[PDB]
């Protein structure tokens, strides 16, 4: 059990279990006062002080107000100040502190309290794994990976530790290494280690270093609650929705906006080739990280329901044309865009943001041979003219070994069965 009333307290521990209980009952406008009027007639109470900052914590959640939660965190801030102050309660006030500071993103100002609480308990490495999520959320990896490697060292298999040294290794292209500690602190069990994000990075090295066991390890974060299924590994997502990788034009109900991109096809390449051969530079590169190898750029015209006016400037028909369908115009988790890659090239398999859109591809210029993508197990190839749809919520690899440029189309429109009201209330990502 904790100890938190000093000797002091525990002579006035009388009136402060008072003062919890009319907070622990909940009423919190009844507690903040008692407690207040605590820390004006006793000043030196580390535990009235406590409970101050305890009760204005809550009225923060309650009031879902940050200048309250500020107050909070300074008066958790002041129990530190006090003499004598029993440790257990110490440890508790400042990691509330160094927690809401990180609620309210002031992440150096959490990294300074974790600092603090390590200078005053060298020995809980709890606290230096919490040190280390700090430096974390400040870009320091090198001080983070240093932290660990001091924990490591003391204490060889915390998981805790194990899985963000694992992250961190992955973050320096030291992806094969980072596999073990990412299995070994899963496998621990321990606290902070049953995280979505330690499953997602471990199947992604896994994945990159060719390891067939990745799908194995995304089923069992699949079994944890973290993803969808084995194959369905989106972050936000909307419950309820019709869960396959690939689509007809029939079951997503938008065979006119199918029709008009495959009747008009011809048109819709003639003006991204147009803007290849004239205004290459609007051609973006994609993010190297999904990119293996290859050349492999993109041309935007919608991005999360904003037209880009400069660029629709470049393709003014197809822009032109695609006003005609919300359901991808105002896809606000979606895009409109041009894709062009070029042979030699290989994504790595990957999953969208997202399961609330579908993607459509039309194909505008498909080499004879070697364009593929694999959606989920199906894998399937592009006809110049034609669409494909998929949910790329599902896992999906694209491979380009041809030996011209192909380039397609990426139209994305809201899940069919979303409702009106459900995509006009879907915060854009």
């Given at each position: 059990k904790p100890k938190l009333l000093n000797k002091f307290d525990?002579?006035?521990?009388?009136?402060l279990d008072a003062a919890e209980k009319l907070r622990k009952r909940g009423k919190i406008e009844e507690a903040v006062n008692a407690f207040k009027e605590l820390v004006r007639k006793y000043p030196q109470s580390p535990r009235?002080?406590?409970?101050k900052a305890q009760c204005e914590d809550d009225l923060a959640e309650k009031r879902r107000s940050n200048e309250v939660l500020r107050g909070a965190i300074e008066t958790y801030q002041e129990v530190a100040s006090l003499p004598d102050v029993p440790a257990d309660l110490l440890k508790l006030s400042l990691k509330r502190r160094s927690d809401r500071q990180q609620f309210l993103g002031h992440m150096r100002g959490s990294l300074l309290t974790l600092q603090r609480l390590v200078q005053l308990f060298p020995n809980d490495t709890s606290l230096k794994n919490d040190l280390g999520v700090g430096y974390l959320l400040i870009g320091d990896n090198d001080n983070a990976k240093k932290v660990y490697e001091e924990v490591l060292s003391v204490t060889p298999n915390d998981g805790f530790a194990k899985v963000h040294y694992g992250f961190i290794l992955k973050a320096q292209n030291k992806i094969a290494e980072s596999i073990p500690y990412l299995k070994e602190g899963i496998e621990s069990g321990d606290p902070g280690?049953?995280?979505?994000?330690?499953?997602?990075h471990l199947g992604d090295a896994m994945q990159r270093v060719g390891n067939k066991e990745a799908y194995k390890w995304y089923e069992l974060g699949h079994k944890r609650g973290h993803f969808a299924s084995v194959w369905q590994r989106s972050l936000y997502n909307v419950n309820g929705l019709k869960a396959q990788p690939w689509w007809t034009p029939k079951e997503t109900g938008y065979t006119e906006l199918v029709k008009s991109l495959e009747r008009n096809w011809k048109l819709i390449r003639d003006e991204g080739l147009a803007v290849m051969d004239k205004?290459?530079?609007?051609?973006?590169?994609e993010d190297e990280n999904l990119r293996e190898k290859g050349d492999w750029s993109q041309f935007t015209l919608w991005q999360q329901g904003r037209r880009n006016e400069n660029a629709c400037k470049?393709?003014?028909k197809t822009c032109t044309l695609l006003e005609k369908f919300p359901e991808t115009t105002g896809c606000r988790?979606?895009?409109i865009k041009y894709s062009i890659m070029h042979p030699g090239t290989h994504v790595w398999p990957a999953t969208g943001?997202?399961?609330?859109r579908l993607r459509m591809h039309l194909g505008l210029v498909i080499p004879k041979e070697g364009c593929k993508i694999r959606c989920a197990n199906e894998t399937k190839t592009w006809e110049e003219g034609k669409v494909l749809i998929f949910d790329d919520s599902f896992e999906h690899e694209v491979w380009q070994d041809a030996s011209s440029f192909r380039l397609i189309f990426i139209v994305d429109v809201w899940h069919p069965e979303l409702t009106?009201?459900?995509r006009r209330s879907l915060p854009a990502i």
């Open positions: 525990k002579t006035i521990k009388a009136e009235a002080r406590y409970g280690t049953d995280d979505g994000r330690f499953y997602f205004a290459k530079g609007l051609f973006l590169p470049g393709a003014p988790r979606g895009q943001p997202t399961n609330c009106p009201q459900q």
